[PDB]
Amino acid sequence: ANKQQNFNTGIKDFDFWLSEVEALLASEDYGKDLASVNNLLKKHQLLEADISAHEDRLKDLNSQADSLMTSSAFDTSQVKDKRETINGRFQRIKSMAAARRAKLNESHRLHQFFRDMDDEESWIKEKKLLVSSEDYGRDLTGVQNLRKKHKRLEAELAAHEPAIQGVLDTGKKLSDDNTIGKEEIQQRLAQFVDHWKELKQLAAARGQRLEESLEYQQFVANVEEEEAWINEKMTLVASEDYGDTLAAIQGLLKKHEAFETDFTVHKDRVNDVCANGEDLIKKNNHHVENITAKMKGLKGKVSDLEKAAAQRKAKLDE
Template identity: 35%
Template sequence: LQKFLQDCQELSLWINEKMLTAQDMTYDEARNLHSKWLKHQAFMAELQSNKEWLDKIEKDGKALMAEKPETEAMVKEKLASLKVMWDDLESTTQTKAKCLFDANKAELFTQSCADLDKWLTGLDGQLQSDDFGKDLTSVNIMLKKQQMLESQVEVRQKEVEELQKQSQALSQEGKGSDEADGKRISVENKFQALLAPLKMRRDNLMASREIHQFNRDVEDEILWVEERLPLATSTDHGHNLQTVQLLIKKNQTLQKEIQGHQPRINDIMERSQFEEGIHLVWHKTVLLPDHNRP
């Protein structure tokens, strides 16, 4: 019961905190309507993701009532109170969306198109880069940046879809225009056109990492061999029984090391065939000048 009451208290405090945000109609830190819209979208997504919190408390409450019937009155009261608070929060959030944005759909639509277009231009510039890393460390850093870009693209994909909905809503209300919809179509086409270069850059970075990793592994193997070569090529055969036995023991140890290391060498040799293919593709797609590039 105490755990249930504590969970109810924590959710109640969280709802009260979010209600203050939902009631704030200014978003003073946002510079334009589009920025305000994005902040509000993120806020609504946060509410939706935390709906599971309320659902879990309701589930726990029902289980508690079944286990301890004497708590039914208190549990029902707490659940009802939380439900009312949650409904008020959702209602206030929807009202805020209507007050802030519904009356300015056309302006929001135009700003959203401009913001997306600017971002896509920046993305295009990043994808034009022919720097795929000079070593394993740098290419791994670039792959992390690539992952961030791809995550941003997923977010922007939702914005593109939202633009389609806004365009339909404006048309139904008679507030749409061919010029505005033309901007949306242009942004959508620009977005779709960058998906292939985005994937190609990831493929090139992955190929670059494979090559650098292979080169590092080969260097490690060369070092491993060089460290053991003096013992393997030594002409010292011992001057007495004790030294001969010691050399025999060292030789046996070396043979075991070589035998145990053989799978590693085999792996390098197998990968060398694969890396040769990567090098050929890399040479054709990356290293050779692209005469078709503007």
């Protein structure tokens, strides 16, 4: 119930706690997300406290050692290395605890960082969803509204570009600070970049496919404009009735010489409309299909008018 027995009893108890703490510090788990990391840190704070509280016992055990080396009644050499072992071992758990606390804080910034990368990955995904629209509008006004909307989306992205780079810059910085999971951040940054590049590729294609619709709708609009005029003329021309007096003849014939002139101007605007169309075909337009058809129709109606305008004259130039 005194020193000799005491020191040795104390040393065996401390030895027991040491191996146990060492076993715990054998951990290689550092978290997989914020949830666990937090749990690991809370758990590691308890252990650190336990080791800190063990310093009194360590001070005491060394005191006992000191006073035992002051007696020749036995051979001190025994307590000597015992004192030197626990002090060594203690020092090592301190060091390891420190090492574990470091990798855990590292891990915490890592998963926190992925938290952020995630926020922007979902933002990109949302935009990918909008830009994948295949709504190209069924008419001039419609197309313009779609373009007006697409233009503000491309602005949204341009406005957000700095946040995207931020993730990137923040990330490369962790990779340089050998954050425990270097292999993991190298794969996510790579992936994060592809998503972004995709989103921009997709917005480019969409935007250009829209200009095509705009140009096309604009072509269709012009074709119909000339056809509406042709349909009108197609009518008047269908009026044979020359009354029964010479006066009404030139009256019509005059209105026909006048029609003939208008028709020249118009069948010329038709050539431009077709030239316009041909050009769209040249620049490879989504609607090379309708352009062909719409042109074949116009020209046809031009012939038809050319057929009736002649026979009317055929009676009027009498």
